[PDB]
Amino acid sequence: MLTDPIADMLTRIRNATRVYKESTDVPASRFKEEILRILAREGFIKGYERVDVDGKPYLRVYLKYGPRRQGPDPRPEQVIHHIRRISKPGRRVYVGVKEIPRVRRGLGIAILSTSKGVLTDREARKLGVGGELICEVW
Amino acid sequence: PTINQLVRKGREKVRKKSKVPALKGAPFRRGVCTVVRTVTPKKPNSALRKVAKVRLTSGYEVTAYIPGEGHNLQEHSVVLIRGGRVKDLPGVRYHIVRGVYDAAGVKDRKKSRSKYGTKKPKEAA
RNA sequence: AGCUAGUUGGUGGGGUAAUGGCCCACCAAGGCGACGACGGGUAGCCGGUCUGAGAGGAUGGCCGGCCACAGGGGCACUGAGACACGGGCCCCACUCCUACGGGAGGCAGCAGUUAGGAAUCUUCCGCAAUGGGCGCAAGCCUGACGGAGCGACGCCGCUUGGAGGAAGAAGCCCUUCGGGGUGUAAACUCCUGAACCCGGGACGAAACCCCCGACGAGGGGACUGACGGUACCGGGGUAAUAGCGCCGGCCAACUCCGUGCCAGCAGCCGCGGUAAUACGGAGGGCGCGAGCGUUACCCGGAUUCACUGGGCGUAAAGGGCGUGUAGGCGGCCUGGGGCGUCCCAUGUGAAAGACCACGGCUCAACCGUGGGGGAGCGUGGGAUACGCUCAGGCUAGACGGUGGGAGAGGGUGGUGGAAUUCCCGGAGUAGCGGUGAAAUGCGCAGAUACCGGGAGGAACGCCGAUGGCGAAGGCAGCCACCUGGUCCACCCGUGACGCUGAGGCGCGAAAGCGUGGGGAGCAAACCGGAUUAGAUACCCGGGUAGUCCACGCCCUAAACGAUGCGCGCUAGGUCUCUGGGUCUCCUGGGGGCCGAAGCUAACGCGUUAAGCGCGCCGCCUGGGGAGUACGGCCGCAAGGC
RNA sequence: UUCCCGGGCCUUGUACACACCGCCCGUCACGCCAUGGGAGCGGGCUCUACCCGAAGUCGCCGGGAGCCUACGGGCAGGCGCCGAGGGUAGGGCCCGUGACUGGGGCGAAGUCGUAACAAGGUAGCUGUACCGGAAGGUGCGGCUGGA
RNA sequence: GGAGGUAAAAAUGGCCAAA
Ligand SMILES: NC[C@@H]1O[C@H](O[C@H]2[C@@H](O)[C@H](O[C@@H]3[C@@H](O)[C@H](N)C[C@H](N)[C@H]3O[C@H]3O[C@H](CO)[C@@H](O)[C@H](O)[C@H]3N)O[C@@H]2CO)[C@H](N)[C@@H](O)[C@@H]1O
Ligand SMILES: [Mg+2]
Ligand SMILES: [Mg+2]
Ligand SMILES: [Mg+2]
Ligand SMILES: [Mg+2]
Ligand SMILES: [Mg+2]
Ligand SMILES: [Mg+2]
Ligand SMILES: [Mg+2]
Ligand SMILES: [Mg+2]
Ligand SMILES: [Mg+2]
Ligand SMILES: [Mg+2]
Ligand SMILES: [Mg+2]
Ligand SMILES: [Mg+2]
Ligand SMILES: [Mg+2]
Ligand SMILES: [Mg+2]
Ligand SMILES: [Mg+2]
Ligand SMILES: [Mg+2]
Ligand SMILES: [Mg+2]
Ligand SMILES: [Mg+2]
Ligand SMILES: [Mg+2]
Ligand SMILES: [Mg+2]
Ligand SMILES: [Mg+2]
Ligand SMILES: [Mg+2]
Ligand SMILES: [Mg+2]
Ligand SMILES: [Mg+2]
Ligand SMILES: [Mg+2]
Ligand SMILES: [Mg+2]
Ligand SMILES: [Mg+2]
Ligand SMILES: [Mg+2]
Ligand SMILES: [Mg+2]
Ligand SMILES: [Mg+2]
Ligand SMILES: [Mg+2]
Ligand SMILES: [Mg+2]
Ligand SMILES: [Mg+2]
Ligand SMILES: [Mg+2]
Ligand SMILES: [Mg+2]
Ligand SMILES: [Mg+2]
Ligand SMILES: [Mg+2]
Ligand SMILES: [Mg+2]
Ligand SMILES: [Mg+2]
Ligand SMILES: [Mg+2]
Ligand SMILES: [Mg+2]
Ligand SMILES: [Mg+2]
Ligand SMILES: [Mg+2]
Ligand SMILES: [Mg+2]
Ligand SMILES: [Mg+2]
Ligand SMILES: [Mg+2]
Ligand SMILES: [Mg+2]
Ligand SMILES: [Mg+2]
Ligand SMILES: [Mg+2]
Ligand SMILES: [Mg+2]
Ligand SMILES: [Mg+2]
Ligand SMILES: [Mg+2]
Ligand SMILES: [Mg+2]
Ligand SMILES: [Mg+2]
Ligand SMILES: [Mg+2]
Ligand SMILES: [Mg+2]
Ligand SMILES: [Mg+2]
Ligand SMILES: [Mg+2]
Ligand SMILES: [Mg+2]
Ligand SMILES: [Mg+2]
Ligand SMILES: [Mg+2]
Ligand SMILES: [Mg+2]
Ligand SMILES: [Mg+2]
Ligand SMILES: [Mg+2]
Ligand SMILES: [Mg+2]
Ligand SMILES: [Mg+2]
Ligand SMILES: [Mg+2]
Ligand SMILES: [Mg+2]
Ligand SMILES: [Mg+2]
Ligand SMILES: [Mg+2]
Ligand SMILES: [Mg+2]
Ligand SMILES: [Mg+2]
Ligand SMILES: [Mg+2]
Ligand SMILES: [Mg+2]
Ligand SMILES: [Mg+2]
Ligand SMILES: [Mg+2]
Ligand SMILES: [Mg+2]
Ligand SMILES: [Mg+2]
C-alpha cells in the first residue's frame, strides 16, 4: 500500500543502479516530480518524463552512470553511489537554517522540503528557509 | 526496535553493582580479626596464604588477605581493610593495610615500602 | 493495578491582605488511573561542576538563586512582614539548680569539647575596608565581614646550585676476566647565591566630620589600618632537603644471587615444583619529583541500551498460531485553515562560572574590564513544500458482484474390506514361540500349520509423490449432510473503506486429569527368562494405566523454515501441483532445486531472501545460579504464565 | 582377506587438539560461602476504630460569685468543637533472628558407575508420564541439531 | 528399479605443566 512512496522511489532507483538499467517506472505524483527535478538539475540522472503504463500515470527515470572501467569487474562507476531517506514517517526530521548537515564537505547534496518548495542544502541555506530534511545523496 | 517502541519502552541503563560492599563506597574500614589462619588457593596454584576473618565497624564479617612475609596479627588485633580481591582465594575480596594500628610493616623490606607499610632504613648512606 | 470522605462539583457561610473544601452547614455523585493513579524506595532543586568528538552520562561540595528546618511534635501572640535560630505557651526525651514546692537550658551561628568514623581546623586579631541595625549627629553594636593560624587537601610559582673536570679515582654490580657499568657522576677549581642579618617601609583611605557657599551644587581643611613593621625596596651574606612507584605482554625500563607450587606476586592474561628478565635482595635502568603510589567513587574507552550509533536461521534474541481493542503508520488530484514545521522582529533566558581579547598582582594560580551568540518560552508579522484538519474528486490499494477450479480444511451421521486377538465346529499331529545363541512361555487337558462360522476394538494397503489442504497444532478406506478458507476469467459495483496490533479473546500435537463408556493389537509401571562384575537397561515371554468415544479440564514442545506480519523494487535456468487464453506458447496462484547483482563471520540466502526499503508488533544485552526462589494470577492435581 | 595386530589413499562424523592411554556426566564423602522453607520470636515504618486528651485559635455563657476610666461595654473565669501526645485492639509492608530442612555455587590429585561427544557401542535431543543408588531407563508424540 | 535399510560383545586412564 506504499507506506512511504518517497523512500520507495529512492529504492527503485537504488535497485536499478546496481543492475545498470536505462530507466525505471515509478508512481506519479507532483511531489515526486520535484524530487526528480532536483536529481536532474544536480546531474544525478538524465531526466524524467510523464509516461502512461496500463492507463496509470508513471514516471520513467532515466538513470546515469560513469565510464566503463577496465580490468576485472569492468562495471562502470555510479554517479549515484547511495541515496536514502532521512525524514521517515516513523521519525520526522525537521531542521532550521543553522542545523543543516554538510554532505561530504559539499560534494554531495541534501534534498529537503521547505515552504518555498523542494530545495537543496545549498539553495535552502542561501535563501535561509530550511525544513523537513527529505534525503541526502552522496 | 522501532522508533515507536523506543518512545514507549525506552533504553535501560546499565547500573553496575559494586564488587566491594564497604557501606556506600568507603575507601577504608577499621575492624578486628576473629581468627587468623591459612587457606589453600585454586587449581593453578598451591601454597598457604595468610588470611584473617575480620569483623569491622559495620557488623559485617568478611575475610581479608595479609600481604608480605611475616606478620603480628592475632585473634584480638585491630586492622584496617583496604579493598581488592585475591584471584586465587575464593571469598576473599579485601586486603589488610600493613602499617596500621595492630598490623606491623614487613621487616627487612626495602623495595616497595609504600605498600606493606615499611619505614625508610638508614645505614649511614 | 485499581485509588478516592472534604473524596469531585454546586449553593450559602466562617477565615485571609487575597482566590481556593482552606474550614463549616445543606445538596448532587462525582473525581483520578497503563499518557502508569495509588503504594513502596531514594533524594532538597537550579545556575552550574566532572567527563565526553558530539549526542549523551554522572553529579549538585566552595560561590550565587529558591525551598525547608532551629532538640522531636503542636500552637498561637505582637507585628507591614514570623507560626519566628539566639521571642512566648504546652507535651515528650535528655542536662543542670533545688530549702523537695518548683526553677533554668536548647551551637544546623563563631571558636572549642565529647562520641561516631578512614577523615576534616583556631576556645586567634579588628570593626581599618565593604555591608547591615539604630541615631539628624557625635557615635554604639555587628564571630556578616576583612584578616591572621593549623592541614602538601587542590592548583600555581620557587629552591636543594651554575660553568669546568679522567680513555675516565675509591667502593659496589656484571664478565667470556681482556674488560664493561654506575659515570662528569664524585672529589677538586672558579662563579652566582634560597636561607639568614641590618636599614627603610606601604597601596588598600575617602567620605561621614569642619569652614566658604542658603547645613543643596561647587570648593577647601582635618581624623582614622586589624593584616603589620607583613608585602615590597636597598645593603651584607651560607653551596644549602629527595623522595616515591615501576622494569613478562598490555607498558618505558635487564642482569646477578637467594628460594624451589615453599616463601610469595597478581588490574587482565597469569608467574613460582633447582640455572624465575613475573617471588626477595643487589646493581643498573624507566617514569614522575615535594611529591609518588594504593583504596573508593564518576565519565571515557563500551558503537557493551546503539537518537546521532546495535542486533534476533545456526553466536543471546521472532511471541506456538490466529482474531482483534487502544495505539502507531498510511495511495493520487484540487482548494480552505496554518496545529506541527520554517523565517523575521521583540521581551526573557540574573550574577558568577565557560570561551575570546586586553589588563592587575615581578610570572602563574588567582582576579578585573570589555565582546559573542546559545538552547528553550511569551508576543507580533510572514511563508504553505511536507506532516495535520476540513471540503470535493479519483482510481492502481482493499472489499464486493457474475461465471467457473482444485484440495486428507473442519464438524455430524452412516458404511466397506484386509489383518490381529478370542469363542465355536471340523480335520490333524510331538512340538510351537523366540534369539546372536538360548531360556522363561505355550503344548498329548489335542497346542502351533489348515478350513468354516461368530464376536469385538482400532487403523485404513495399493492409489501415494520429491503431491495436496490449513493461521498454527495438524489433516489419508467409502457415501451423504452442514461448513471454513483459497485460486482464475470478466473487468461489473463501493470507493481509502488500508497495514500492524500492547491488552483481551479463541484455537492449540503428545503426555497428563475428572465423569461415564469401550478395550482387539500395542504398551509406561510391574513380574519373569536371558546378558553382565553388577542390569532397577538394551534382547525375549507376560502385563496395568494409557492408547479409543462423548463432555469438561490441562496450554507444554526441537509448537522448526530454530527465519513475525503487510507492501514496493532487483537476471535467469529447471522439475512439479492447480486455473485461464487467439491452449506451439503466453499469463496468474502454489510447492522444490541450481544460481545474476547483492548480503553474510562463515555455512549459506538468493522474486517461497537471510538482497534493496517503509510501516507496526514481539524479543536479546557474557556464562553458571535459573526458567530456580519469593510474590501475584491460572489449575482438581500434575503443574503453567 | 570375513575375523585379530600394525600401516597407506580417499571420504564421513567429532563436544578430541600434551590429540581415545582423549573427553566427559550425575549421585555419594569432606570443607567454605550465600540463599529458600521453618514451630515461631524480636524490631522499624505505616493504616483503621475507639478511650483519655495539654497549650492554643475559634464559638457560646459570663450567671445564685468576681475586677474595670464612659456600663446594650471590656477583662478574669466557665463550657464546647478541633487538637500535640498517650492508651487499647486489629491489620499492611520491610528488616533481623530461629531447632531443623531444601536445593545452589566454590574448594590439585576421595568413592560408585558410563549417560553424552566417533551408529560413543541402544542415533541424539525434546515436551509429558512412570520408574530407578546415580548418571539415567522406558512409554506416547515431535525435531535434524542423524543415517 | 525407487524407497522400506544391518549391530551380540567388552568398563576405566590421578593432578599441574613448553614462545
Ligand atoms: N555446578 C557444579 C556442580 O558440580 C557437581 O559436582 C561436584 C562433585 O560431584 C564433584 O566432586 C568431584 C568428583 O566428581 C570426582 N569424581 C572426584 C573429585 N575429587 C571431586 O572433586 C571435588 O571434591 C574435592 C574434595 O573431595 C575438592 O577438592 C574439589 O575441589 C571438588 N571439585 O565436584 C563438584 C563440586 O566441586 C556436578 N558436576 C554438577 O552438579 C555441577 O557441575
Ligand atoms: Mg564492607
Ligand atoms: Mg602454578
Ligand atoms: Mg612488587
Ligand atoms: Mg463539610
Ligand atoms: Mg534526605
Ligand atoms: Mg563516546
Ligand atoms: Mg542538635
Ligand atoms: Mg496582627
Ligand atoms: Mg528570631
Ligand atoms: Mg543557638
Ligand atoms: Mg560550632
Ligand atoms: Mg573514634
Ligand atoms: Mg565596620
Ligand atoms: Mg559602616
Ligand atoms: Mg572570615
Ligand atoms: Mg671505579
Ligand atoms: Mg655540574
Ligand atoms: Mg590607605
Ligand atoms: Mg558637605
Ligand atoms: Mg638581596
Ligand atoms: Mg608507574
Ligand atoms: Mg618494554
Ligand atoms: Mg636462580
Ligand atoms: Mg611485574
Ligand atoms: Mg625482582
Ligand atoms: Mg568505566
Ligand atoms: Mg555509550
Ligand atoms: Mg538505532
Ligand atoms: Mg550486538
Ligand atoms: Mg544452541
Ligand atoms: Mg540461539
Ligand atoms: Mg514463528
Ligand atoms: Mg486502529
Ligand atoms: Mg497522505
Ligand atoms: Mg503554525
Ligand atoms: Mg550569566
Ligand atoms: Mg599580566
Ligand atoms: Mg479348535
Ligand atoms: Mg503331536
Ligand atoms: Mg479361522
Ligand atoms: Mg469497474
Ligand atoms: Mg477524501
Ligand atoms: Mg492482524
Ligand atoms: Mg492440547
Ligand atoms: Mg491426548
Ligand atoms: Mg491422551
Ligand atoms: Mg496418575
Ligand atoms: Mg481418561
Ligand atoms: Mg504384549
Ligand atoms: Mg560388563
Ligand atoms: Mg516387553
Ligand atoms: Mg521443522
Ligand atoms: Mg513443528
Ligand atoms: Mg522459541
Ligand atoms: Mg512460482
Ligand atoms: Mg557472487
Ligand atoms: Mg540457492
Ligand atoms: Mg507480530
Ligand atoms: Mg517448565
Ligand atoms: Mg598410495
Ligand atoms: Mg574411554
Ligand atoms: Mg587432552
Ligand atoms: Mg529465613
Ligand atoms: Mg453599651
Ligand atoms: Mg493516636
Ligand atoms: Mg522471619
Ligand atoms: Mg542451609
Ligand atoms: Mg542413551
Ligand atoms: Mg556411552
Ligand atoms: Mg553403551
Ligand atoms: Mg535398542
Ligand atoms: Mg547411545
Ligand atoms: Mg522422554
Ligand atoms: Mg524400566
Ligand atoms: Mg509437527
Ligand atoms: Mg572407577
Ligand atoms: Mg586424564
Ligand atoms: Mg600446579
UniProtKB/Swiss-Prot annotation, chain A:
GO biological process, one term: translation
GO cellular component terms, A-Z: ribonucleoprotein complex; ribosome
Keywords: Ribonucleoprotein, Ribosomal protein, RNA-binding, rRNA-binding
Matches recorded under Pfam families: Ribosomal_S8
Entries under SUPFAM superfamilies matching the protein: Ribosomal protein S8
InterPro entries linked to this entry: Ribosomal_uS8, Ribosomal_uS8_CS, Ribosomal_uS8_sf
Molecular functions (GO terms): rRNA binding; structural constituent of ribosome
Domain of life assignment: Bacteria
HAMAP family in the cross-refs: Ribosomal_uS8_B (MF_01302_B)
Assembly and oligomerization: Part of the 30S ribosomal subunit. Contacts proteins S2, S5 and S12.
Function: One of the primary rRNA binding proteins, it binds directly to 16S rRNA where it helps nucleate assembly of the platform of the 30S subunit central domain. The combined cluster of proteins S8, S12 and S17 appears to hold together the shoulder and platform of the 30S subunit.
PANTHER family to which the protein is assigned, alphabetical: 40S RIBOSOMAL PROTEIN S15A
Similarity comment: family membership: Belongs to the universal ribosomal protein uS8 family.
Name recorded for this polypeptide: Small ribosomal subunit protein uS8
Organism, scientific name: Thermus thermophilus (strain ATCC 27634 / DSM 579 / HB8)
Gene for this chain: rpsH
UniProtKB/Swiss-Prot annotation, chain B:
PTM note: The methythiolated Asp-88 contacts a modifed residue of the 16S rRNA close to the decoding center, and might be important for decoding center assembly.
GO MF term set: rRNA binding; structural constituent of ribosome; tRNA binding
Keywords from the named record: Methylation, Ribonucleoprotein, Ribosomal protein, RNA-binding, rRNA-binding, tRNA-binding
Modified residues (3-methylthioaspartic acid): D88
UniProt KW Disulfide bond keyword: no
Keyword Signal among record annotations: no
Superkingdom in the source lineage: Bacteria
Biased composition (Basic residues): 108-119
SUPFAM superfamilies reported in the protein's UniProt record: Nucleic acid-binding proteins
Pfam family, one: Ribosom_S12_S23
Protein role: With S4 and S5 plays an important role in translational accuracy.
HAMAP family the UniProt entry points to: Ribosomal_uS12_B
Name used for this protein in its record: Small ribosomal subunit protein uS12
